[model samples]
Structure formats: structure tokens, C-alpha cells
Target chain A: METIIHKIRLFDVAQADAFEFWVQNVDYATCPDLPSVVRFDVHRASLQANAPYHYVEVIKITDRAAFDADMETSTFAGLVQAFSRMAEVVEELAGEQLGSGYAAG
Target chain B: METIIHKIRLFDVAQADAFEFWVQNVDYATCPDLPSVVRFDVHRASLQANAPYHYVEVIKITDRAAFDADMETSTFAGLVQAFSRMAEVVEELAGEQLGSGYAAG
Candidate 1:
């Protein structure tokens, strides 16, 4: 699987989750477990919630296209809907391919 | 251990190994392997080498202060010296702690 990193933007941090935060920030136990998600780590800006950056996320995916393809999956749909309800595209970067080499596994 | 993300700066991409790149981008076996370092992944600006950002690294540390404490360790010193030889500190972000709850392990 390839590792991908991307920044997610939320139009209104105040209007979006005015009183509460993401499910993971409120009640993680009930947070959806998307079948294909290995890690859904998200980070916020230290200086500002909505600044030059909002959130940075990391996740693993075998099929890059399939990542978005599976968004409508039962497990993933809700979060996608919720996230899209507040988020916007910012910047996305793919793991670079090195012509160099890898250490022994 | 905490997962941390930070951007590393290279003052001179032109002065850097112009022909070759970082060791990991050429020959990974020789790359330093510090006990405390997990991922030293580097990314170049698609737009520019010495741009607003150079490389982004992910690492883990038990003691936040100790992350910089083992610079002289034989395993890490070489890369540290080489990296310092070309890189500079830009910004760092630590994994945030949620006030909510967590799902079962």
C-alpha cells in the first residue's frame, strides 16, 4: 500500500462544529470503522484552526482510486458525508517514488 | 511514543547533492538508522526544491525532548550531521490528544 498525505479544509470551524468536534474528538468509541482504513490520523494547526491549513491526514491505500471509490461504502459513507458537509479540498501529495533503494526488511 | 510531523529545510538545493539526492533517495542501505527514528521520509517541493518547504518527516519519540537528545548516538549522528549539513528546522506538529474517548484496541 502507498502512503498518502493530504490537507483538508473546513469552511467554517465555528459554523461547522461550533459546539462539538469530530466524532473522534467527542466519542471515539462510536466512531465508524471504515473497512479499508488503516489509519485516519488527523492534525490541526497549532496557530489557528482555519488558517493556511486546517487538517493534515494520513492513511494507507492499496488502490489509490479505490480510496475514493469506496467512500460510499456503508462503513465509510457517513463519515464521508459528514466530512464533505464541512470540508473542502486543499492540497494532496503522493508518496514520492525513489530510484534509490530500501533497507533490508 | 508520539507521532510527530515536521518540515525540514535545505538552505541550498543547488548546493546540496545536486546530482545525487539524499542517501535514501540513492542508496538506502547506507542511510543512518537511529534507534528512535522510525520514518525519515523526505519530500521535495513539486514546485521547487528549496521552496516554502523541503522535506517532511514522521518520527516517534518517548520523550519529546529526547528526540533531539541522541544526536551524538553513532547510529543517528551520521545522518544528523549529513542532514544538518543540508537541512534546517522549519516547523513541527505533534499528534493531538483528544478530550473525547477512544475505541477498543
Candidate 2:
């Protein structure tokens, strides 16, 4: 199977949470219709106060054509929309943190 | 402590081997004038014939300034030069497996 790697950076703590939520809600077997996707690995690191914002997320696509097709489907749209809603929740959390909070990416 | 993430891609099998060799040779405790590097993580995935080359190497830098300084030192140069030598080995390996070997990244 052909593969592609997609890397994304979340804007802040809230954005990260939203992305995680979306991943949790994703039903891989039913949603994308990409049967060739063999494995998916996600990773993130906690941000330190003095560090540059460097959080990253990687999505491994096993079937390049199938993944490309899924990207054009409504499932992808739903995921993005869900993230948009959670962005508000993230902003509220960031607001509570004040000076230490990260700016939206 | 502050942190930085540096990601690099190895060009071929030999370049990957050279990186592994350099990591093995790295004397984190004895060489640097400045201190504070807490951890270093290296990773790579085997390339498949039908897949888009998706290997990645990530270095976790706990001390931003110290890592920056080390990059400027002769040690970094030595590592790069070492990889240059290994490029020939990589080419040889690639030639033997023409159908499956990856193009240099």
C-alpha cells in the first residue's frame, strides 16, 4: 500500500484538546472508508513555560488514493467543524490561564 | 527548563546508519561546555516499495540555548561529514534492490 504522512500543529492547549476530541470521536472503520490504513500513531508533548510552542500531530495514511478520497468527503468536513466548536472551549481554558496561555495558532 | 524540537530526514539507508552511528558516538556528558540537555529521542521507519517515504527523526531538546550552541560546534560538523561518507554505502545498497530501494530524501 502507498502511504503519506501529514503533520499538523495545534494553536494552543484548547486547540490540542479539540484535536484530541476529534480523534476520539473518529470511528476509523466506518468513517473514512480507507480500508488500507494499517496503523495510526498520534503524539504530543506538554509545553513548558519558557519553551517555544512546538506541539505536533502526525497522521499516517496507508493508502494514498483512499486517504486522498477521504479528504474530499463530508467526513473530513465534519471533523473540521467539530474542531471549530471545540476551539471555543479551548479559548475559555486558555483565558483562565492568563499570562501563560498560548496565542491561537 | 526550556525545550526545542528538531526534526531531520535521512536521505537513504546509509545516511540513516550514519545518524545511528553518530548518536551512538555522542558523548552528551563529556563534550559540551554548557549543560542541560535532558533527553534525545531518535526514530525511523523502514520504507516500503509502494509507500511514499515516511521516515522521521525527532530530537527532543530540553535546553534550547545549549542545543543551539552544540549545533554550532565541531561535533555537528563531524556528524554531517560522517553521513557524507556513508552516502556511498547507501547508494550501493539501493543499487542492489532497485525495485524496492528508496530514492534519497
Candidate 3:
């Protein structure tokens, strides 16, 4: 499997809140039908704070061609656009957000 | 080869300082003779901040037995004790430290 770690930053504080809240309601099995993805794990960069991204989610893409195919899907297209929109303003994500996301604390 | 990710927190802010400073001067080649470790990469939990640990290091161990053997070495013995001592007070590490440790920001 090919492992790809994407640094994700939401479009705004609202996107941030939505993503955070959304995570509580979803997972890879619930992801928008990206058939090429084998597994997905998301981790917040900091443990216990709020921010646009501050987390780097790692995913294993087993099929590169299919990933391209998957990205072409409308479901994937929407997120990629959101991700692209967020990427466009990457400078604004500026810092890592901390949170209580670890087993230690 | 096996990949192991250890969520590490130094014994204290002092050990924390020493570790952060020490990394600037060391690597697996300069390590405490842990024969099993193949590769080690340490990352600060926060992009631009300091704290005890606040980072998760991922290491690849080629031989678990060798690692066990190395852990018994004087050099390994010393650090593990330090790690163990620090592990004792994990509650204090409390949170992840943030910093400018990413490519995007």
C-alpha cells in the first residue's frame, strides 16, 4: 500500500468546527465513496485546542490510478475542492491547534 | 521490519530541554546502543513551542530481540530508566506542544 500523509487545513473556523463535529459522526467506512483508499487515520497536530487544521491525517492509497479515478468522483471532487479552497489560504492556517487527543492526556 | 510509534514525553521540563537540545546533537547512529532500532524520526508535537515530549517519534525496529538486548545495555539502561521515570509522571506532560514544525506553516 502507498501511504500518503496529507496536511489538511479547513477553509475557515466554521469549516474547522464542522470538520471537528463531523468527525464525531464519521470514519473511512463513512467517507464519501473513495474506492481506491485502503485505510484512513486522522490525527490532530496538537491535543486540545481549536484551529482550522492543526492535524495531519494519514491515508493509505492502494491504487494510484483508481485514486485518480476516485478523486474524479463527485464526492471526492467536493472534498478536494474544499481542500483546495483551504489550500489556497494555507498561510492563514498559520499554527497548530492543541487538544486532548492522545492516550496519555 | 516492524514499525513502532512511541508517544514520548520527557521526564520533566529539564529532561525536555535536554532532549530537545540533545536531538540537535544526536541520531540513531549516536544512540545508546539499541541494536534493534533501524531508523528513528522524532517530531515535535507542536510546530513552535516547547514542552516535555509533546512529540511522537516513529521508529522502525529490524529486530525485536536485539532491541530487547540493547535495552539492557548501559546506555539503553540509562535512557529507559529516564523514560520510565518520566513515564511515571505522564500526567504532568498534560498536553501536546505546538510549533512551526510543518512544511505548510
Candidate 4:
């Protein structure tokens, strides 16, 4: 199985909530072409006073080719669009550079 | 409560295992000065064929002030040093850019 990982940091608490909602409601769906996703886990920061970021999320993918094709599909396009709705929310808290990246496993 | 989140991606399965071990064992310790961390959750990608990343992990921190102090302490320093051990392990699989980021909650 091929896998992909994503790491993102939100600037404020509100953005974090928004992201969480999307993950729960939208990202959990099954994609027929992709390899099965094994797990999706999210974690928040523990210390309040000194920490600089808001939250961290880990997404694991089991199949590589299927995910690639799925990303180009309308379903994923809509998900990206939905994610864009939070741009203002994130910018308000963390500034312009909302940290984001992807990796292969 | 205050919180800080860290997200990291590993290139190979072996590095992932090392990270999980550290988080399970060393990172779980209590800090005297930081606010108590309420929870820590880890997730892996589900699709294998097309995904570009390996995994995503979210770390929640409950207190702000306590974590700040804790990060400055020798204990935190030691943890960073320990993570350095993975430098070679990570480079072998993923190239220079091993994904990493931090957020506040």
C-alpha cells in the first residue's frame, strides 16, 4: 500500500474548530479508486501560555495510485474549495502563511 | 487551558516506528512547570497508491505557561537531542525536507 501524510498548523482556535469539523464531516468518506485509508488522527497542543501554534493533524493513506486519481476528481476539488472558506479565519489568527505540506510513505 | 501542537511526517516505515516509540515513552512524561497536557493522538494515512505523504500527528497541550517553561528546561532540550538521532534515519528515506510544524491551541 502507498501512503501520504499531511501536516497543517492553524493560527487560531476558531480555525482549528473549522478544520476539525471538515475532517469529521467531509474527509472521512471512502474513495473507490484509492487504496484503503488505515487511520486518521488529530491532536491539539497541551501547553497554552508559550506555544506558538494551534493544532497538528496526521492523515495516513494506504494506497498511492488511487489517492492520486481521487485528488483530481470533483470530490476532492470540492473539499479543497471547502477548505478555502477558512482562509480568512486562518489569516486572522496565524497570518498569511498557514503551514501545510504533504509527504509520501 | 493552553495548548501547542506539533505535526511531523516520516519518509520511511522505520522512522515512523522510532517516532511512535519516542512519543509513547519519552514524550508522555509530565512536566512540573507546564500546564497539564490533556491528550495526544496520532493518525496514519489510509490510501496507499497515490498519496504523497506518510502520516499526520496532532499533539494537544492543555496549559500555555507551563509548556513555555518546560520547553526551555533541560528535559525539553534532551528530547530535541534525542530526536536528532533520527536525522540519518529520516534522510535515508525522504530527502532533506522531513515535514515538521508547531501550532498554538
lDDT of 2 by residue, B1-40 (tens): 3323233334555455445555445522223433344433
Check candidate 2 and list the clashing pairs. Answer: A11-A105, A14-A90
What is each candidate's fraction of native interface contacts (fnat)? 0.15, 0.00, 0.01, 0.00
Question: How high is the TM-score of chain B in model 3?
Answer: 0.57
Question: Candidate 4 regions off by >4 Å?
Answer: A29-36, A46-53, A87-105, B1-105
**Interface RMSD for candidate 1 relative to the native interface:** 6.6
Tens digit of lDDT per residue, candidate 4, span B51-103?
34334333334445555666787878887787656422211111111122222
Question: How many pairs of residues in model 4 come into backbone collision?
Answer: 60
* Candidate 3: tens digits of C-alpha lDDT, residues A1-105: 343444455545445555644443443334536776754545444323344345555444554676678767787766655455433223211111122111111
- A best-first ranking of the candidates according to their lDDT comes to 1, 3, 4, 2
lDDT, candidates in the order shown:
0.52, 0.38, 0.45, 0.42
lDDT of 2: 0.38
After superposing candidate 3 on the true structure, give the runs of residues whose Cα lies further than 4 Å from its correct spot.
Answer: A11-15, A24-29, A47-53, A81-105, B1-105
Which residue pairs does candidate 1 place in steric collision? Answer: none
Candidate 1 DockQ category?
incorrect
Every candidate's DockQ is 0.21, 0.05, 0.06, 0.06
Candidate 4, lDDT over the whole model: 0.42
